[PDB]
Amino acid sequence: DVNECISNPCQNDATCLDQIGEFQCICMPGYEGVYCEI
Ligand SMILES: *[C@@H]1O[C@@H](C)[C@@H](O)[C@@H](O)[C@@H]1O
């Protein structure tokens, strides 16, 4: 488990933001879904 965020988890034009223990993606203004899918 080395760097889960390789190319942004979100399946959109979102932004990545994770570390050795955390994991959070910056979805879009009004976008539902764990990885911007809705
Ligand atoms: C990271 O956040 C997302 C939501 C977008 O605004 C990107 O342009 C930015 O780099």
Tab-separated table of N, CA and C and ligand atoms in Angstrom:
chain	number	residue	atom	x	y	z
A	1	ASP	N	0.828	-1.201	0.000
A	1	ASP	CA	0.000	0.000	0.000
A	1	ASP	C	0.866	1.256	0.000
A	2	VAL	N	1.370	1.620	-1.174
A	2	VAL	CA	2.213	2.802	-1.311
A	2	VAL	C	1.568	3.836	-2.227
A	3	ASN	N	1.067	4.914	-1.634
A	3	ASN	CA	0.424	5.976	-2.398
A	3	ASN	C	-0.788	5.444	-3.154
A	4	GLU	N	-1.939	5.435	-2.487
A	4	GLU	CA	-3.172	4.950	-3.097
A	4	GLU	C	-3.602	5.852	-4.251
A	5	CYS	N	-3.277	7.136	-4.144
A	5	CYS	CA	-3.632	8.101	-5.180
A	5	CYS	C	-2.529	8.203	-6.228
A	6	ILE	N	-2.672	7.440	-7.307
A	6	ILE	CA	-1.689	7.445	-8.382
A	6	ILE	C	-2.031	8.497	-9.431
A	7	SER	N	-3.300	8.543	-9.821
A	7	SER	CA	-3.759	9.503	-10.817
A	7	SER	C	-5.147	10.027	-10.463
A	8	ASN	N	-5.290	10.515	-9.235
A	8	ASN	CA	-6.562	11.050	-8.764
A	8	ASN	C	-7.645	9.970	-8.774
A	9	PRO	N	-8.211	9.637	-7.599
A	9	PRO	CA	-9.260	8.616	-7.493
A	9	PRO	C	-10.540	9.030	-8.212
A	10	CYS	N	-10.920	10.293	-8.052
A	10	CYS	CA	-12.119	10.821	-8.686
A	10	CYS	C	-12.100	10.567	-10.190
A	11	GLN	N	-13.238	10.149	-10.737
A	11	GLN	CA	-13.341	9.878	-12.167
A	11	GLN	C	-13.808	11.116	-12.915
A	12	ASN	N	-13.220	12.245	-12.549
A	12	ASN	CA	-13.544	13.524	-13.162
A	12	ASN	C	-12.325	14.443	-13.118
A	13	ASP	N	-12.543	15.744	-13.278
A	13	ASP	CA	-11.448	16.705	-13.242
A	13	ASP	C	-11.214	17.209	-11.818
A	14	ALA	N	-11.323	16.303	-10.845
A	14	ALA	CA	-11.130	16.649	-9.449
A	14	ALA	C	-9.650	16.767	-9.104
A	15	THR	N	-9.369	16.989	-7.826
A	15	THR	CA	-7.997	17.123	-7.353
A	15	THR	C	-7.688	16.071	-6.290
A	16	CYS	N	-6.436	15.624	-6.250
A	16	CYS	CA	-6.015	14.617	-5.282
A	16	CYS	C	-5.522	15.271	-3.996
A	17	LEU	N	-5.588	14.523	-2.899
A	17	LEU	CA	-5.150	15.026	-1.602
A	17	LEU	C	-5.152	13.911	-0.560
A	18	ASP	N	-4.104	13.095	-0.573
A	18	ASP	CA	-3.985	11.989	0.370
A	18	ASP	C	-2.558	11.867	0.892
A	19	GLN	N	-2.374	11.031	1.908
A	19	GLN	CA	-1.059	10.823	2.501
A	19	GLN	C	-0.933	9.411	3.064
A	20	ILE	N	0.190	9.133	3.716
A	20	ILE	CA	0.429	7.820	4.301
A	20	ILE	C	-0.498	7.571	5.489
A	21	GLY	N	-1.782	7.386	5.198
A	21	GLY	CA	-2.751	7.141	6.249
A	21	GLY	C	-4.100	7.765	5.956
A	22	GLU	N	-4.097	8.836	5.166
A	22	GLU	CA	-5.332	9.526	4.810
A	22	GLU	C	-5.687	9.292	3.346
A	23	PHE	N	-6.824	9.839	2.925
A	23	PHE	CA	-7.282	9.693	1.548
A	23	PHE	C	-8.557	10.498	1.315
A	24	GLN	N	-8.417	11.643	0.658
A	24	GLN	CA	-9.559	12.505	0.374
A	24	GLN	C	-9.417	13.169	-0.991
A	25	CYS	N	-10.486	13.120	-1.779
A	25	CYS	CA	-10.486	13.718	-3.110
A	25	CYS	C	-11.363	14.964	-3.141
A	26	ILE	N	-10.901	15.992	-3.846
A	26	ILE	CA	-11.650	17.239	-3.955
A	26	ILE	C	-12.595	17.200	-5.150
A	27	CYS	N	-13.815	16.737	-4.913
A	27	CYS	CA	-14.817	16.637	-5.966
A	27	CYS	C	-15.128	18.007	-6.563
A	28	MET	N	-16.201	18.069	-7.345
A	28	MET	CA	-16.615	19.314	-7.983
A	28	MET	C	-17.785	19.945	-7.233
A	29	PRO	N	-17.962	21.272	-7.358
A	29	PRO	CA	-19.050	21.992	-6.689
A	29	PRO	C	-20.418	21.411	-7.030
A	30	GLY	N	-20.897	20.506	-6.185
A	30	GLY	CA	-22.189	19.886	-6.415
A	30	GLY	C	-22.071	18.554	-7.130
A	31	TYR	N	-21.058	17.778	-6.759
A	31	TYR	CA	-20.829	16.474	-7.370
A	31	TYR	C	-20.901	15.368	-6.322
A	32	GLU	N	-21.845	14.448	-6.498
A	32	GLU	CA	-22.017	13.344	-5.561
A	32	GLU	C	-21.170	12.143	-5.970
A	33	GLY	N	-20.867	11.283	-5.001
A	33	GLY	CA	-20.066	10.104	-5.277
A	33	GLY	C	-18.746	10.116	-4.531
A	34	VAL	N	-18.304	8.941	-4.092
A	34	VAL	CA	-17.048	8.822	-3.360
A	34	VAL	C	-15.880	9.355	-4.183
A	35	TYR	N	-15.888	9.053	-5.478
A	35	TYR	CA	-14.830	9.504	-6.374
A	35	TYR	C	-15.414	10.261	-7.564
A	36	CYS	N	-16.301	11.210	-7.274
A	36	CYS	CA	-16.939	12.015	-8.314
A	36	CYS	C	-17.450	11.142	-9.458
A	37	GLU	N	-18.565	10.461	-9.224
A	37	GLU	CA	-19.153	9.593	-10.240
A	37	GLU	C	-20.602	9.981	-10.531
A	38	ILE	N	-21.261	10.599	-9.554
A	38	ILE	CA	-22.647	11.016	-9.717
A	38	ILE	C	-22.732	12.430	-10.281
B	1	LIG	C1	-8.128	20.798	-7.365
B	1	LIG	O1	-9.481	20.897	-6.919
B	1	LIG	C2	-10.418	20.559	-7.959
B	1	LIG	C3	-11.804	20.582	-7.343
B	1	LIG	C4	-10.277	21.533	-9.125
B	1	LIG	O2	-10.611	22.847	-8.697
B	1	LIG	C5	-8.846	21.513	-9.649
B	1	LIG	O3	-8.686	22.504	-10.653
B	1	LIG	C6	-7.875	21.782	-8.504
B	1	LIG	O4	-6.539	21.646	-8.966
